[PDB]
Amino acid sequence: PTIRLQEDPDPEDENLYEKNPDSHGYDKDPIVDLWNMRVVFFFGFSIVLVLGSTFVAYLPDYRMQEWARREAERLVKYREANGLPLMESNCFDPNKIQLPEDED
Amino acid sequence: MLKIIIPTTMLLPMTWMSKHNMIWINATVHSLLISLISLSLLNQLGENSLNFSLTFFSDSLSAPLLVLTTWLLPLMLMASQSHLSKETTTRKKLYITMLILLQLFLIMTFTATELILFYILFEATLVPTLIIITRWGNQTERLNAGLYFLFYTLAGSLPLLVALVYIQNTTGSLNFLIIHYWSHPLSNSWSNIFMWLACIMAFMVKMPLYGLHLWLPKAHVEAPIAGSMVLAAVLLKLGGYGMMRITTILNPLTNYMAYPFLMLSMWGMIMTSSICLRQTDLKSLIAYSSVSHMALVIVAIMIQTPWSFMGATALMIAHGLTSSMLFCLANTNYERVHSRTMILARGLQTLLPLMATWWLVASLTNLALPPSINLIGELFIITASFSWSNITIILMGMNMMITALYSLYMLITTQRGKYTHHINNIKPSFTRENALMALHILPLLLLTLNPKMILGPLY
Amino acid sequence: SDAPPLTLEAIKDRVLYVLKLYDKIDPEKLSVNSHFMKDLGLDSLDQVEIIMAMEDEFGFEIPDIDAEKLMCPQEIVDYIADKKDVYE
Amino acid sequence: NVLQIVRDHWVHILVPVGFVFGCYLDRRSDEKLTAFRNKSLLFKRELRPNEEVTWK
Amino acid sequence: KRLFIIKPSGFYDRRFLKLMRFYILLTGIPVAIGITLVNVFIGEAELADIPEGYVPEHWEYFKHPISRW
Amino acid sequence: AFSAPAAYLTHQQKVLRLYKRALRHLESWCVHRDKYRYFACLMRARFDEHKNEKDMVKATQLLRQAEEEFWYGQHPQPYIFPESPGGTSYERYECYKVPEWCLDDWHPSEKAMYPDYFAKREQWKRLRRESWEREVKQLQEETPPGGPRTEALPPARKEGDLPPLWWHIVTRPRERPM
Ligand SMILES: CCCCCCCCCCCCCCCCCC(=O)OC[C@H](COP(=O)([O-])OCC(O)COP(=O)([O-])OC[C@@H](COC(=O)CCCCCCCCCCCCCCCCC)OC(=O)CCCCCCCCCCCCCCCCC)OC(=O)CCCCCCCCCCCCCCCCC
Ligand SMILES: CCCCCCCCCCCCCCCCC[C@@H](O)O[C@H](CO[C@H](O)CCCCCCCCCCCCCCC)COP(=O)(O)OCC[N+](C)(C)C
Ligand SMILES: CCCCCCCCCCCCCCCCC[C@@H](O)O[C@H](CO[C@H](O)CCCCCCCCCCCCCCC)COP(=O)(O)OCC[N+](C)(C)C
Ligand SMILES: CCCCCCCCCCCC(=O)SCCNC(=O)CCNC(=O)[C@H](O)C(C)(C)COP(=O)(O)O
Known part of the structure; x- marks a missing residue:
């Protein structure tokens, strides 16, 4: 036969615009395609995007940024008035630390 | 966090019980709802992590990754339904099943409290990806691409398993909280050096580190579009997440074991950026872009500073979004002209203006235009490297110039010039493709508006 | 606005004007179908000079392969009209 | 007529039901880790005249 | 005269843009x-000291009504 | 740009091209018109001095010498017409050129405007569809057995034929499309 095998020919690609000039590119069935467009748009842009962005914008301050700012204001006020240094090099009281006896 | 895991497991029978013509609609709607639910994980604390149970916990590093995974599922669904139209119903359901299983494994991987469970899930992510690539790829190179993807990964991951069981026999636990609180320094001995290498090489090959990246162009070019999306956006970030987790027990040995990987990352960053300048395949260019950005992420993780960790987190999220968008943009042209060669279809801005705008925005985020989170991450990493050593700016500086060059080269080659005369089958952009590009790009700028949500636990 | 919509009559008028400002061509003996070699007795160099004069008049160059072929004012006018998309 | 509508769109309750079941199971899991409720040095508190537990 | 100007179809891009605008505004104007x-x-809310003997609720530690809700 | 090229140029063709190039570059050097006319007449006299050389070898040697002199003495920044391949407006309007097949994909609402234009378009398309096979067969007949040797195409000869391969030459976008 001068052939090697029985095979279907490679078919041409279908244009969704031919049977549906406003086809939205979701499906060949116009009704299913239209509703796929609608659900994608509503649940992506209207619900997740805008409402999720609002939710994230108004999340309560569990990172304690404002609490830390107010605590630092109290500490600075107290230390400035008393004449104490604003900050201490050692964050742990040396009285609770026991260095090794001998360094030689 | 079963309120997120269980709905995906329910996505499975929902897909397998749907009518033959509603599978895409149902999967997309419920995937988007699951993403909305996962959005609640962004409410993180400042001191410790959210410890849901003995098995699952959520940190400020894994919450954006989970949100990215759950958001990426619907986009993959929209991107896949075009070229799967002629497929039978059972095979379409199997494709959706593969995607759902991949999402479930990824969701469980980012929240596992133990390292062995994390290993099991991070290795279970292989089977759906390999099946997707080798079954629904287009060309005959997909088989070799699957083999390369499998064995490069496993040859790195098995020594990690040995090291993990050894560590559990030594310290008595692999729970991450116990590991962090009861951390002890690593001495300088050959046993400790090889333990370091066993704990690091699997994540290095996942990034992938330069010289160990040959699997990535094959796998990311030969895969279908959803495979490429999830391979570039999420699966590469497993290496970075695992490396930031595991480096807790590797100090102070890292102080000098990081040198070869740092040199490889910087020089291979330069090399992969240069490779992007002479590339005839449009998808391979995007793959090598991913390699360069991940080399930057490797450097940031290796130098071990708070600024470098913040930059690494931001860069991983930004790169996931940008690279997924670029892959989808290339797939649109491929579906139009059935060829990946970059200089075949030219002057496309004349024929498709809105798609040209999407191309411009994607390539602008690729080159890290301020104040995008791409640039926030890149600049944090560059500052951390400069503090590490003032001479890194030269290598970092060269990379910035090269990245801009190849990004705009891609843009000008594909969109500008004159349209090829013989190609007359370039139909107008569908609503689906435009919605896909918009859903890629709008979250990027929205995250730019509030950047502390992607800056990690060191913030 | 911009320059007017150039027409075939204007093109022919300008071509004949330039040709009648040429000292080696007699005005009345010149016609719109006059050949440069046969009827007017010009050599190749004169044809090259005429082509350059046409280029100056219309503000655009003509490729040498195309330029060599034109032999009568009709061919020059036709080439100019086809180049500038003139149909009326 | 709702028979066909239900048999065509009953797959739309699986995911919300999974969500509420996951919420319930998370509450149940939280119920098993109360060994230190109202016992930490930072949050130890005297009970109100009416309440029984500080958190659920 | 007035000539015809050949352009690619601008219908579908405009339709997508107006659909996106419509849905985004539909949910974002009420918000x-x-x-x-x-x-x-x-x-x-106005910052105030905790009265003696009072144990505030966990949401009573934030100032914005939407954040508190 | 419109004529099919030949396998090679002839000696007189090369001389004419060099003459045009030299005149243009001399005009670039001589900005003013009277000076240009003076030196152009001098150049023409110099060109036609050796016009009557029957030894082709010495003619080509003189042509070689003249080309070398031109390359040494050319203007580094010669005048270019704005739409010539090096001009400031060379490909300025290429971005406004849209192929005619793009009209096949317009939405029916877009085609609702301009009904008569699209009726004429349908007539043109029917004409092309009817003439294609006759064009192909005429090309088949007129082509030598060993394939074509030049890029020149035959015209129409029969009753209502059309010159083969005409659609993309006739339906060019425009020179000022938008
Ligand atoms: C088109 C789409 C196409 C595609 C594009 C892509 C779109 C993607 C969208 C995705 C979703 C994004 C959603 C984002 C969620 C974020 C919402 C949020 O957090 O709101 C934040 C923020 C609300 O802050 P807040 O924390 O909630 O309030 C805290 C206080 O308690 C409040 O203080 P208060 O007690 O004073 O109350 C103030 C109150 C009342 O204020 C007043 O009444 C006073 C105002 C002054 C009037 C005084 C004179 C006028 C009257 C005088 C005459 C009448 C009286 C006398 C009568 C006789 C006449 C003589 O006003 C408000 O409540 C705030 C306005 C509400 C805005 C909420 C935004 C939600 C957006 C979600 C929808 C997203 C889609 C967009 C669609 C939205 C619709 C287009 O809203 C703002 O954006 C404020 C911005 C205005 C500030 C001024 C601008 C300063 C400019 C500086 C930069 C200069 C450089 C140049 C750059 C200029 C560029 C602007
Ligand atoms: C097509 C035409 C386009 C042009 C026309 C557009 C017309 C104008 C509209 C453009 C808006 C201009 C932007 C200007 C900024 C104003 C909004 C800003 O003020 O809000 C920010 C708030 O923005 C949000 O916080 C960021 C949005 C969150 C982004 C998350 C994306 C949603 C999930 C989607 C999928 C996720 C994928 C990625 C995985 C990680 C402020 O943050 P914050 O300083 O606090 O507020 C202080 C007061 N609070 C705290 C009480 C609220
Ligand atoms: C293609 C990309 C692949 C990925 C790249 C992976 C990178 C792996 C590189 C490993 C980094 C360092 C490994 C070992 C640490 C030091 C290396 C050694 O050369 O340093 C000296 C070691 O001295 C000598 O070099 C001895 C080692 C000589 C034998 C090693 C073979 C190296 C040959 C190169 C083979 C290529 C290896 C990679 C295969 C692909 C230090 O002196 P010393 O203080 O005494 O040893 C320190 C350990 N102590 C404290 C316990 C004693
Ligand atoms: C600004 C600086 C640039 C200037 C530098 C240039 C200097 C070049 C000047 C000297 C070069 C010459 O003249 S070299 C002269 C070469 N001589 C011959 O070729 C003899 C045979 N004649 C023919 O072949 C044709 O008759 C022909 C003469 C071509 C006319 O063609 P028509 O009659 O059939 O139109």
Whole structure:
């Protein structure tokens, strides 16, 4: 036969615009395609995007940024008035630390 | 966090019980709802992590990754339904099943409290990806691409398993909280050096580190579009997440074991950026872009500073979004002209203006235009490297110039010039493709508006 | 606005004007179908000079392969009209 | 007529039901880790005249 | 004269743009109106000291009504 | 740009091209018109001095010498017409050129405007569809057995034939499309 095998020919690609000039590119069935467009748009842009962005914008301050700012204001006020240094090099009281006896 | 895991497991029978013509609609709607639910994980604390149970916990590093995974599922669904139209119903359901299983494994991987469970899930992510690539790829190179993807990964991951069981026999636990609180320094001995290498090489090959990246162009070019999306956006970030987790027990040995990987990352960053300048395949260019950005992420993780960790987190999220968008943009042209060669279809801005705008925005985020989170991450990493050593700016500086060059080269080659005369089958952009590009790009700028949500636990 | 919509009559008028400002061509003996070699007795160099004069008049160059072929004012006018998309 | 509508769109309750079941199971899991409720040095508190537990 | 100008089909891009605008506005105009109404008619809380013997609720530690909710 | 090229140029063709190039570059050097006319007449006299050389070898040697002199003495920044391949407006309007097949994909609402234009378009398309096979067969007949040797195409000869391969030459976008 001068052939090697029985095979279907490679078919041409279908244009969704031919049977549906406003086809939205979701499906060949116009009704299913239209509703796929609608659900994608509503649940992506209207619900997740805008409402999720609002939710994230108004999340309560569990990172304690404002609490830390107010605590630092109290500490600075107290230390400035008393004449104490604003900050201490050692964050742990040396009285609770026991260095090794001998360094030689 | 079963309120997120269980709905995906329910996505499975929902897909397998749907009518033959509603599978895409149902999967997309419920995937988007699951993403909305996962959005609640962004409410993180400042001191410790959210410890849901003995098995699952959520940190400020894994919450954006989970949100990215759950958001990426619907986009993959929209991107896949075009070229799967002629497929039978059972095979379409199997494709959706593969995607759902991949999402479930990824969701469980980012929240596992133990390292062995994390290993099991991070290795279970292989089977759906390999099946997707080798079954629904287009060309005959997909088989070799699957083999390369499998064995490069496993040859790195098995020594990690040995090291993990050894560590559990030594310290008595692999729970991450116990590991962090009861951390002890690593001495300088050959046993400790090889333990370091066993704990690091699997994540290095996942990034992938330069010289160990040959699997990535094959796998990311030969895969279908959803495979490429999830391979570039999420699966590469497993290496970075695992490396930031595991480096807790590797100090102070890292102080000098990081040198070869740092040199490889910087020089291979330069090399992969240069490779992007002479590339005839449009998808391979995007793959090598991913390699360069991940080399930057490797450097940031290796130098071990708070600024470098913040930059690494931001860069991983930004790169996931940008690279997924670029892959989808290339797939649109491929579906139009059935060829990946970059200089075949030219002057496309004349024929498709809105798609040209999407191309411009994607390539602008690729080159890290301020104040995008791409640039926030890149600049944090560059500052951390400069503090590490003032001479890194030269290598970092060269990379910035090269990245801009190849990004705009891609843009000008594909969109500008004159349209090829013989190609007359370039139909107008569908609503689906435009919605896909918009859903890629709008979250990027929205995250730019509030950047502390992607800056990690060191913030 | 911009320059007017150039027409075939204007093109022919300008071509004949330039040709009648040429000292080696007699005005009345010149016609719109006059050949440069046969009827007017010009050599190749004169044809090259005429082509350059046409280029100056219309503000655009003509490729040498195309330029060599034109032999009568009709061919020059036709080439100019086809180049500038003139149909009326 | 709702028979066909239900048999065509009953797959739309699986995911919300999974969500509420996951919420319930998370509450149940939280119920098993109360060994230190109202016992930490930072949050130890005297009970109100009416309440029984500080958190659920 | 007036000639025909050959262009690619601008119908589908315009349709997508107006659909995206419609849905985004559809959900984002009510949200903006609600935020404005809440801010005008339910202001932010005023920082005050904890009265003796009172144990505030966990949401009583934030100032914005939407964050508190 | 419109004529099919030949396998090679002839000696007189090369001389004419060099003459045009030299005149243009001399005009670039001589900005003013009277000076240009003076030196152009001098150049023409110099060109036609050796016009009557029957030894082709010495003619080509003189042509070689003249080309070398031109390359040494050319203007580094010669005048270019704005739409010539090096001009400031060379490909300025290429971005406004849209192929005619793009009209096949317009939405029916877009085609609702301009009904008569699209009726004429349908007539043109029917004409092309009817003439294609006759064009192909005429090309088949007129082509030598060993394939074509030049890029020149035959015209129409029969009753209502059309010159083969005409659609993309006739339906060019425009020179000022938008
Ligand atoms: C088109 C789409 C196409 C595609 C594009 C892509 C779109 C993607 C969208 C995705 C979703 C995004 C959603 C984002 C969620 C974020 C919402 C949020 O957090 O709101 C934040 C923020 C609300 O802050 P807040 O924390 O909630 O309130 C805290 C206080 O308690 C409040 O203080 P208060 O007690 O004073 O109350 C103030 C109250 C009341 O204020 C007033 O009444 C006073 C105002 C002054 C009036 C005084 C004179 C006028 C009257 C005088 C005459 C009448 C009286 C006398 C009558 C006789 C006449 C003589 O006003 C408000 O409540 C705030 C306005 C509500 C805005 C909420 C935004 C929600 C957006 C979600 C929808 C997203 C889609 C967009 C669609 C939205 C619709 C287009 O809203 C703002 O954006 C404020 C911005 C205005 C500040 C001024 C601008 C300063 C400029 C500086 C930069 C200069 C450089 C140049 C750059 C200029 C560029 C602008
Ligand atoms: C097509 C035409 C386009 C042009 C026309 C557009 C017309 C104008 C509209 C453009 C808006 C201009 C932007 C200007 C900024 C104003 C909004 C800003 O003020 O809000 C920010 C708030 O923005 C949000 O916080 C960021 C949005 C969150 C982004 C998350 C994306 C949603 C999930 C989607 C999928 C996720 C994928 C990625 C995985 C990680 C402020 O943050 P914050 O300083 O606090 O507020 C202080 C007061 N609070 C705290 C009480 C609220
Ligand atoms: C293609 C990309 C692949 C990925 C790249 C992976 C990178 C792996 C590189 C490993 C980094 C360092 C490994 C070992 C640490 C030091 C290396 C050694 O050369 O340093 C000296 C070691 O001295 C000598 O070099 C001895 C080692 C000589 C034998 C090693 C073979 C190296 C040959 C190169 C083979 C290529 C290896 C990679 C295969 C692909 C230090 O002196 P010393 O203080 O005494 O040893 C320190 C350990 N102590 C403290 C316990 C004693
Ligand atoms: C600004 C600086 C640039 C200037 C530098 C240039 C200097 C070049 C000047 C000297 C070069 C010459 O003249 S070299 C002269 C070469 N001589 C011959 O070729 C003899 C045979 N004649 C023919 O072949 C044709 O008759 C022909 C003469 C071509 C006319 O063609 P028509 O009659 O059939 O139109």
